[PDB]
Amino acid sequence: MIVLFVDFDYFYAQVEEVLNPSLKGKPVVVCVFSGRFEDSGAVATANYEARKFGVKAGIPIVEAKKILPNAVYLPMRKEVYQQVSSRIMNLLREYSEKIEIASIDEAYLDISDKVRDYREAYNLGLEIKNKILEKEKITVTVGISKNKVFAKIAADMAKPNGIKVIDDEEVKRLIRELDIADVPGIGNITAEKLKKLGINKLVDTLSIEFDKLKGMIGEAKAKYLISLARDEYNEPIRTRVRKSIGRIVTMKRNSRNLEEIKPYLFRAIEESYYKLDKRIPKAIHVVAVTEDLDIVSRGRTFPHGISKETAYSESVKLLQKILEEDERKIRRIGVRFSKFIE
DNA sequence: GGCTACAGGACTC
DNA sequence: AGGAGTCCTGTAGCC
Numbered sequence: 001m002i003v004l005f006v007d008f009d010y011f012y013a014q015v016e017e018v019l020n021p022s023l024k025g026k027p028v029v030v031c032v033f034s035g036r037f038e039d040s041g042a043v044a045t046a047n048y049e050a051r052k053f054g055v056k057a058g059i060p061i062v063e064a065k066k067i068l069p070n071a072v073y074l075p076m077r078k079e080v081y082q083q084v085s086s087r088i089m090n091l092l093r094e095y096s097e098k099i100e101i102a103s104i105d106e107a108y109l110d111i112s113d114k115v116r117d118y119r120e121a122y123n124l125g126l127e128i129k130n131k132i133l134e135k136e137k138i139t140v141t142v143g144i145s146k147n148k149v150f151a152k153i154a155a156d157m158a159k160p161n162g163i164k165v166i167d168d169e170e171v172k173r174l175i176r177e178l179d180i181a182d183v184p185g186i187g188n189i190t191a192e193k194l195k196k197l198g199i200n201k202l203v204d205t206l207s208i209e210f211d212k213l214k215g216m217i218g219e220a221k222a223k224y225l226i227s228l229a230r231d232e233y234n235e236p237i238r239t240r241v242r243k244s245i246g247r248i249v250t251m252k253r254n255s256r257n258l259e260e261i262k263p264y265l266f267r268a269i270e271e272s273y274y275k276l277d278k279r280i281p282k283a284i285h286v287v288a289v290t291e292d293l294d295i296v297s298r299g300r301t302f303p304h305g306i307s308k309e310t311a312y313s314e315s316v317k318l319l320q321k322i323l324e325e326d327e328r329k330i331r332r333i334g335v336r337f338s339k340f341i342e
Numbered sequence: 343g344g345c346t347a348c349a350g351g352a353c354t355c
Numbered sequence: 356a357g358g359a360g361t362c363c364t365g366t367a368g369c370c
């Protein structure tokens with residue numbers, strides 16, 4: 001298998017750039033304003049000008065404002081970004097039919113059937129960039145290798161506005177010299193559990209006993225890392241089918257009062273049903289973030305599709321069950337729908 | 343022992 | 356300290 005991965009660079013910021021090029025060269029911070037008070041919320045993304053000075057995704061807008069007060073701060077406009085993304089994804093469809101759209105700004109192409117060797121792939125990646133640069137004036141980063149993981153790793157090493165192939169020898173060099181924390185799916189909690197155990201690099205998972213590693217990180221993550229380390233990871237590029245849709249909103253004040261949480265719950269439901277479109281869910285989950293930022297949720301599956309009016313009703317009962325079974329105040333509340341009708 | 347549904351955890355961002 | 360979505364795991368109810 002040969003896999004080409006494309007990752008759009010600083011995507012939300014770059015779209016804002018394209019809709020207003022006067023922004024180009026200045027630091028740009030796309031934000032999610034929670035609506036508690038002036039500048040409550042977080043940075044969803046920043047362009048590389050802003051990232052130099054430390055303003056990056058996840059930090060609070062307040063923290064960012066300290067560092068770059070003259071930077072342009074823009075509210076997230078996801079609908080816009082999604083339409084730019086859908087257009088870019090169809091351009092990619094012209095270069096392969098086996099396409100896996102992984103997020104709003106990431107896609108894998110199986111380019112076995114389209115390419116013979118890696119240097120031919122690298123020219124294919126130059127074509128794809130320039131097409132996207134011409135058509136949408138969006139820079140992207142391309143990663144090419146033997147599988148999805150190492151193509152993503154390639155693009156991680158090359159962004160922004162980069163191209164890179166990791167050949168079959170490079171893969172073997174990475175197996176034993178890549179900080180295992182740079183492997184997709186290995187976050188901070190799992191990184192630690194690997195150190196607190198011995199494993200700093202992928203090759204190390206072959207020397208530890210399986211049950212010991214399985215004990216720490218779980219069967220699936222152990223099987224995954226092992227398969228990567230043996231160079232036997234080969235998972236297919238397959239079309240991703242959306243499995244759930246939902247909305248969570250931040251309330252202006254924390255609360256355990258049913259009657260003042262309800263309006264936010266109901267808006268989240270109205271917004272979620274719009275977004276559902278023609279999809280009919282058989283399952284609903286109410287999700288709350290407590291004041292100490294812990295996530296609590298209750299859900300029910302139905303032997304039939306959930307009408308909006310049933311959503312309204314079941315959601316209050318599920319919310320009541322949260323209030324009853326968990327004693328902490330609620331800060332954020334929404335819903336999530338799943339198990340769609342086929 | 344092994345299957346299915348839930349509620350939480352971890353990760354991608 | 357926002358918002359969205361996925362896969363995985365421990366537990367319980369049931370063959």
Ligand SMILES: Nc1ccn([C@@H]2C[C@@H](O)[C@H](COP(=O)(O)OP(=O)(O)O)O2)c(=O)n1
Nearest residue numbers: 008009010011012044045057058104105355
């Ligand atoms: N915590 C984060 C991280 C990234 N993002 C958004 C969501 C995702 O679609 C987009 C991708 O990130 P971006 O292109 O800015 O940079 P990178 O590719 O993530 O380095 O940023 C977010 O909303 N929240």
Ligand SMILES: [Ca+2]
Nearest residue numbers: 007008105106
């Ligand atoms: Ca990305």
Ligand SMILES: [Ca+2]
Nearest residue numbers: 007008009010
């Ligand atoms: Ca990106």
